[PDB]
Amino acid sequence: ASVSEGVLRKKYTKFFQENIKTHLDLKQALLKEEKPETALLAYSLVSPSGYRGEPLTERKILEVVSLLDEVKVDGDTYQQLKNTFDSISKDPRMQVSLENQYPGKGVGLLVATGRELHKASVNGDAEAYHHQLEQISQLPGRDQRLSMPMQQTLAIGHAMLSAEGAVGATLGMATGYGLNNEVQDQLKQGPMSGVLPRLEISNVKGDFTFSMQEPAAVRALMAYLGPKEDTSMSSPQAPKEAQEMEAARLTLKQMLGSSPNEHLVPDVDSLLKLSDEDMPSQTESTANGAFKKLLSEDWDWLMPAVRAMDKGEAGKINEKLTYKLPLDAANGRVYLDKSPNLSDAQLDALDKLGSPSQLRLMYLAEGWI
Amino acid sequence: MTELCPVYAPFFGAIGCASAIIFTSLGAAYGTAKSGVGICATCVLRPDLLFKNIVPVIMAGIIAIYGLVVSVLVCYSLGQKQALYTGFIQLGAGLSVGLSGLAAGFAIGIVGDAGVRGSSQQPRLFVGMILILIFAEVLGLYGLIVALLLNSRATQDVV
Amino acid sequence: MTELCPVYAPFFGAIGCASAIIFTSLGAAYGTAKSGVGICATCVLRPDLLFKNIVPVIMAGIIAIYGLVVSVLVCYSLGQKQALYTGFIQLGAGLSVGLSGLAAGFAIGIVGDAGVRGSSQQPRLFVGMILILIFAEVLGLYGLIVALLLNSRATQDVV
Amino acid sequence: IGIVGDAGVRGSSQQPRLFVGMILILIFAEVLGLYGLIVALLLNSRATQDVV
């Protein structure tokens, strides 16, 4: 109802037939019709980074992200995303989020193997947490333009880190490469992520440009959309520079599904505790322990529990998820059942959350709650 | 060498010291494998009974500990110039603890599989499983006792 | 040659040095084959659990590493003019580590197959699979310990 | 190698991500014959040292 991609490289193959290797003199070749003002909008994805600081300026995936930037039918939803990005790119608060995920821009064989079997299992769980999360935003009431490609990027990024865990554990066990490029070529097959705008950054440290199909720029965008608004920056008492970067911030936080009351501060650190005043308020702390129970009892229980909660029917969770599996016993097949044993205390806490925001479920899939 | 202490005499001691840990490891491996298949088939439905059902695997590992004890105690009595009496005693002790541990491991594996699969749907069967597994554990204990009583006589007044 | 050191004496040492790596390779091959069939049947549906389920194959390869360690340590003690005591000790150490590794490899293969197939549809069964596989790994570890304690006595005060 | 290769080819016909897992398990099956080769070379290096 909100997203429909394709993989037809033969419908518009004239843009990829000749050896076009120049960012300049490509807008005339990208017109190709009697439409001019809307063919420039698909060129706006690569145009601020089309000259400054890049190698060879036309990599073979930079055209398919510009060809399949389908603005031909609809020119409203992508323009709203383009009016919001580069309006979000003004405060240092987005920029300090784009510096935490980055740098500056014998018995010892049993230990080093276990450090990389832990890496292959954490990233194998967290990849599966985004596959059952791209079918929660398939349910009615959600949206798919911002929710789908944001978490399709992360599921590719966890599939590569999980592959590097046990390829490294194999080459260390069989000793005490070309396999990482074979799996990198494999995960680009099949579908591909929807096009989001470019998120250029210009400041006193230079003029930077990130990609938003990188798993580290996605991971810093959702950390920006976390915290609630304050008493400042949205009142008309301060018309200075705030209302064009705060209403652009809240129109993405609502676009996931998070109301401006919802706080959602991250957790990962090297410290013991986080703080005192930004703590979850024991109604969602009881509820976050219920969602973690649904992630780690079954591979298929998070989607029909959010579906049962959008209808306001979050008290029938113990009965709508029960199913029976067989069991060979000493008396025959018995057909016992598996139910999520949600207690009444955390079944009540799922009621006071009206619907889980998509931003809350994506912090949960990254281990930030 | 000597008629009482020939040269082929440490062969029986080395065979006993090997066979103790070999047959107790086979018994422990059968018990661990059968009980682990039972646990992995059971705990798909009741993952909360996972650390409660781990008892037959531990009672299978105790048999391998018995074999390790007898192998160390036999191994610290080998010598180049020992008698045939010592080698025969060491071979008998190794065979005793090894085949007793093999029988106890088979019983622990079969009873543990049936007991875990039965106690998935009947919570009052767990203590009966523990009783029958203790009766399967004392067999390897009896083999350990016979091996220790043999090994205590391997070097008394031997010339 | 000598009555204590005959000419047929390195035969038992060569048989032990071979049999260590032979039986540990058979155990590791059974574990790798059974667990790999389980992984290839499981990961058609969940390819994201592919590098998480690779643990039983690694725990099967550690057994072959144990056999390689014992074969190298026995191989650097062979000689033309050794005693029968040394050859009997080397044969016992080889048989110990080989048959313990064979039993541990069978247990690791069966438990790893069942655990991967069960953990495809129950995410809380993976840690129980790891616990039972560690209990299957310590059996080959016990065989390695008995082989090292035998090999440490193969050349003490031998004439 | 035979059993794992049969299962891995039949599985990777319908799952393209299983090929690298097949290669990992086959490398773990290859190092066993490598270990046998190492033990054979270390034995053969001592077959004629100080033999009378």
Side-chain angles (χ1 to χ4, degrees), chain A residues 297 325-331 334 336-338 341, chain B residues 38 41-42 44-48 114 117-118 120-121:
Chain A
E297 293 284 327
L325 291 171
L327 177 63
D328 290 327
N331 32 303
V334 293
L336 300 170
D337 79 348
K338 184 168 78 181
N341 290 318
Chain B
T42 290
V44 177
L45 296 173
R46 260 119 202 94
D48 50 354
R117 292 178 183 271
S120 67
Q121 63 220 357

Side-chain angles (χ1 to χ4, degrees), chain B residues 9-21:
Chain B
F11 176 72
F12 301 99
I15 289 298
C17 182
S19 66
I21 192 64

Side-chain angles (χ1 to χ4, degrees), chain A residues 289-305:
Chain A
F291 289 116
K292 290 180 185 180
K293 186 173 175 66
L294 293 172
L295 286 177
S296 66
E297 293 284 327
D298 196 72
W299 297 109
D300 284 326
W301 274 350
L302 188 66
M303 184 270 288

Side-chain angles (χ1 to χ4, degrees), chain A residues 208-248:
Chain A
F208 293 157
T209 293
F210 297 108
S211 181
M212 191 58 74
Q213 64 181 356
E214 294 175 352
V218 167
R219 193 170 64 242
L221 192 274
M222 67 180 73
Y224 181 75
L225 294 177
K228 65 183 180 181
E229 64 184 1
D230 51 350
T231 62
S232 68
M233 295 182 70
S234 181
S235 177
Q237 183 60 255
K240 298 185 289 292
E241 290 181 354
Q243 291 82 12
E244 68 270 17
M245 65 176 69
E246 186 72 25

Side-chain angles (χ1 to χ4, degrees), chain C residues 65-89:
Chain C
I65 295 171
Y66 291 163
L68 186 273
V69 168
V70 183
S71 293
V72 172
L73 288 177
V74 170
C75 179
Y76 280 103
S77 295
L78 270 300
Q80 189 185 7
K81 296 179 185 293
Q82 68 178 1
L84 274 176
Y85 175 73
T86 303
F88 289 155
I89 290 297

Side-chain angles (χ1 to χ4, degrees), chain A residues 122-137 147-148 150-159 218-219 222 295 299 302 358 361-367, chain C residues 46 48:
Chain A
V122 170
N123 293 314
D125 290 333
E127 181 182 0
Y129 293 166
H130 293 285
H131 283 93
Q132 61 178 349
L133 196 61
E134 68 184 4
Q135 64 185 358
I136 291 172
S137 63
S147 293
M148 290 286 181
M150 186 181 288
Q151 68 197 0
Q152 288 178 356
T153 300
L154 295 173
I156 300 299
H158 290 291
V218 167
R219 193 170 64 242
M222 67 180 73
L295 286 177
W299 297 109
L302 188 66
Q358 187 64 255
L361 295 175
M362 291 173 71
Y363 287 179
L364 187 73
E366 294 291 324
Chain C
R46 323 191 82 329
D48 50 355

